[PDB]
């Protein structure tokens, strides 16, 4: 009931787009099993469906800071994951944010500070990602 | 007054239409089917088909192959696998095509393959004509 | 007999290469249909 | 009534019916392309036809039958089938074809070795000429001489309703050579042979314009 009354802008910035995709996907998420010939609309919303699901997965006593969620959220939601393997997001997103965490702990930093994603930080999370997936599809 | 029916497996021209007379490109020369004339089966020819209307300036069509038939009754009956207006044939793309095909001509050997050759080599030919 | 006769080929056949030609030789703005016809689906099960 | 299971069977039939209304639509789709292109179909498919009604063939002295792959559609394969059984039955040799993997899991196993060819990938995309032309041509470059074959497939009437039909395959180049073909002349032997060739490929495409159609 309180909502993004208690969301920081960071993550509403993603939050937002995430939950919608989700809805959506929950709408037609049945028709995958069987989906013998579905238009490319709705096999759309089935692939941003399962990877966005894989992103929400989660290892316990490992609980992340809210700038890290952002930049892994970021990552499907963007569309970033989609040409990869429902089977490896949870193996991408891993390594992909020991990356981060390991190198780039200064725009986790602004992400964290400037509370949102600059349009800055947007472009270097756009590098960062699409040079981490080439990287790893090798 | 002969029932005329005219089509491709997609498109159909003519059904049971009053023509006058009709023009069909056979395997032995180019037929000329009449309100009233002897019964007959033909084969096509890569060609032209016209059909002189019940009022003059008549039609024109091009055909690919297929089949015509005319019988006992005044009923005729003219089946192209495929058949087009001039309306619709680019001229430039049929030379292209000649020509790549008597190239390939002259580089086979191989009795079946040249058929396949000669073949298409007629069907473009032929398409300069109306062109 | 016909150059494709004797050699092989059959009628339907001599027809395939001919229709085809015709395609080959349109305009695309009617290039199109040629897609939603000419088709191949069919699958041989022979044993 | 457990709960549970109320609950269960309401999980599997809540997507059963959204599976279901989803194939409904699709299909209506298919249907409604269908129905068009079977206009010119018909006219041309008659017009095969049109020289043997025209005009008598017998026959002195190959059973075709045509579906799909896809069941989930009432009753379109167990017709035709239906009607290949009765005829294989009451008949001079016997040999068949079904285009449509289905015919060949349905009337199948009683009569394997009564097969001569088989089709797939029939029914999800819109068949074209060049399907039948692949038909025909398989079946010319078969061993079977076939005096006399017979088509059976479903003839649309309408949405809902269709009628499993047969026609005759008097292909028999040596059959169109009989009294009432004396009435045609300066017909050379096997000038035939290219026109039976052709009304061949012409029927097949036929039925399988009627029978996407009423599928």
Redesign the interface.
Same mark, same amino acid.
């Not at chain 1, 966005?52 to 970033?80: D, N």
């Not at chain 4, 060949?104 to 001569?116: E, G, N, P, W």
């Given at each position: 009931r309180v909502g993004s009354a208690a969301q920081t802008r960071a993550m509403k910035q993603v939050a937002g787009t995430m939950k919608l995709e989700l809805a959506q996907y929950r709408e037609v998420a049945? !028709?995958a099993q !069987?989906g013998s010939?579905?238009d490319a609309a709705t096999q759309q919303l089935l692939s941003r469906g399962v990877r966005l699901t894989e992103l929400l997965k989660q290892g316990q006593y490992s609980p992340m800071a809210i700038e890290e969620q952002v930049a892994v959220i970021y990552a499907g939601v963007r569309g970033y994951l989609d040409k990869l393997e429902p089977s490896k997001i949870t193996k991408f997103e891993n390594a992909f944010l020991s990356h981060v965490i390991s190198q780039h702990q200064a725009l986790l930093s602004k992400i964290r500070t400037d509370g949102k994603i600059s349009e800055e930080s947007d472009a270097k999370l756009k590098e960062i990602v699409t040079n981490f997936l080439a990287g790893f599809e090798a | 007054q002969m029932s005329f029916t005219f089509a491709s497996p997609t498109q159909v021209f003519f059904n049971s239409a009053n023509v006058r007379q009709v023009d069909v490109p056979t395997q032995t020369g180019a037929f000329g089917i009449l309100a009233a004339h002897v019964p007959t089966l033909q084969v096509l020819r890569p060609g032209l088909v016209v059909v002189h209307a019940e009022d003059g300036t008549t039609s024109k069509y091009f055909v690919s192959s297929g089949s015509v038939t005319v019988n006992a009754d005044s009923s005729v009956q003219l089946l192209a696998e495929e058949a087009v207006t001039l309306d619709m044939l680019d001229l430039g793309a049929a030379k292209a095509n000649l020509e790549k095909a008597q190239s390939e001509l002259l580089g086979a050997a191989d009795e079946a393959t040249r058929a396949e050759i000669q073949i298409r080599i007629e069907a473009n030919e032929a398409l300069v004509k109306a062109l | 007999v016909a150059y494709w006769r004797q050699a092989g080929l059959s009628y339907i056949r001599y027809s395939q290469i001919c229709a085809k030609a015709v395609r080959d030789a349109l305009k695309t703005e009617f290039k199109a249909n040629a897609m939603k016809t000419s088709g191949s689906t069919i699958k041989i099960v022979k044993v | 009534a457990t709960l549970k299971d109320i609950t269960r069977r309401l999980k599997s039939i809540k997507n059963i019916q959204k599976i279901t209304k989803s194939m409904k639509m699709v299909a209506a789709a298919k249907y409604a392309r269908a129905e068009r292109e079977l206009k010119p179909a018909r006219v041309y498919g008659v017009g095969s036809l049109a020289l043997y009604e025209k005009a008598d063939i017998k026959t002195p002295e190959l059973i075709i039958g045509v579906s799909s792959d896809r069941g989930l559609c009432g009753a379109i394969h167990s017709s035709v089938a239906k009607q290949m059984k009765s005829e294989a039955a009451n008949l001079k040799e016997v040999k068949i074809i079904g285009v449509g993997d289905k015919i060949r899991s349905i009337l199948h196993r009683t009569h394997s070795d009564q097969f001569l060819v088989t089709f797939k990938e029939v029914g999800r995309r819109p068949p074209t000429f060049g399907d039948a032309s692949v038909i025909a041509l398989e079946l010319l470059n078969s061993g079977y001489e076939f005096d006399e074959g017979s088509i059976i497939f479903n003839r649309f009437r309408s949405v809902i309703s269709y009628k499993t039909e047969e026609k005759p395959i008097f292909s028999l180049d040596t059959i169109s050579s009989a009294e009432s073909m004396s009435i045609y002349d300066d017909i050379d032997a096997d000038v035939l042979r290219n026109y039976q060739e052709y009304s061949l490929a012409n029927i097949i495409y036929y039925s399988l314009k009627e029978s996407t159609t009423s599928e």
């Amino acid at each position: 009931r309180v909502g993004s009354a208690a969301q920081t802008r960071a993550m509403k910035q993603v939050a937002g787009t995430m939950k919608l995709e989700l809805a959506q996907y929950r709408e037609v998420a049945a !028709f995958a099993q !069987f989906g013998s010939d579905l238009d490319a609309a709705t096999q759309q919303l089935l692939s941003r469906g399962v990877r966005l699901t894989e992103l929400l997965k989660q290892g316990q006593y490992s609980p992340m800071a809210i700038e890290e969620q952002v930049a892994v959220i970021y990552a499907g939601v963007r569309g970033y994951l989609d040409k990869l393997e429902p089977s490896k997001i949870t193996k991408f997103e891993n390594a992909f944010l020991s990356h981060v965490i390991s190198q780039h702990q200064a725009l986790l930093s602004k992400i964290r500070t400037d509370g949102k994603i600059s349009e800055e930080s947007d472009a270097k999370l756009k590098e960062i990602v699409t040079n981490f997936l080439a990287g790893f599809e090798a | 007054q002969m029932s005329f029916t005219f089509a491709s497996p997609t498109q159909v021209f003519f059904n049971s239409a009053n023509v006058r007379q009709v023009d069909v490109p056979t395997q032995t020369g180019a037929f000329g089917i009449l309100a009233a004339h002897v019964p007959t089966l033909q084969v096509l020819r890569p060609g032209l088909v016209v059909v002189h209307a019940e009022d003059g300036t008549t039609s024109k069509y091009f055909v690919s192959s297929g089949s015509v038939t005319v019988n006992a009754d005044s009923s005729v009956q003219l089946l192209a696998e495929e058949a087009v207006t001039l309306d619709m044939l680019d001229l430039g793309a049929a030379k292209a095509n000649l020509e790549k095909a008597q190239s390939e001509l002259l580089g086979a050997a191989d009795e079946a393959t040249r058929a396949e050759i000669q073949i298409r080599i007629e069907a473009n030919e032929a398409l300069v004509k109306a062109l | 007999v016909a150059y494709w006769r004797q050699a092989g080929l059959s009628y339907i056949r001599y027809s395939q290469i001919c229709a085809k030609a015709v395609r080959d030789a349109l305009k695309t703005e009617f290039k199109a249909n040629a897609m939603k016809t000419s088709g191949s689906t069919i699958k041989i099960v022979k044993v | 009534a457990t709960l549970k299971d109320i609950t269960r069977r309401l999980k599997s039939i809540k997507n059963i019916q959204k599976i279901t209304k989803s194939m409904k639509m699709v299909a209506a789709a298919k249907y409604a392309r269908a129905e068009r292109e079977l206009k010119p179909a018909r006219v041309y498919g008659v017009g095969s036809l049109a020289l043997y009604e025209k005009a008598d063939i017998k026959t002195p002295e190959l059973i075709i039958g045509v579906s799909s792959d896809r069941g989930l559609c009432g009753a379109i394969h167990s017709s035709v089938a239906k009607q290949m059984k009765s005829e294989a039955a009451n008949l001079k040799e016997v040999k068949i074809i079904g285009v449509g993997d289905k015919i060949r899991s349905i009337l199948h196993r009683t009569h394997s070795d009564q097969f001569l060819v088989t089709f797939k990938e029939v029914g999800r995309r819109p068949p074209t000429f060049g399907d039948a032309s692949v038909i025909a041509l398989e079946l010319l470059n078969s061993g079977y001489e076939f005096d006399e074959g017979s088509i059976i497939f479903n003839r649309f009437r309408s949405v809902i309703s269709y009628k499993t039909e047969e026609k005759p395959i008097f292909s028999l180049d040596t059959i169109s050579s009989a009294e009432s073909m004396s009435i045609y002349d300066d017909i050379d032997a096997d000038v035939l042979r290219n026109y039976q060739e052709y009304s061949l490929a012409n029927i097949i495409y036929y039925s399988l314009k009627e029978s996407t159609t009423s599928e």
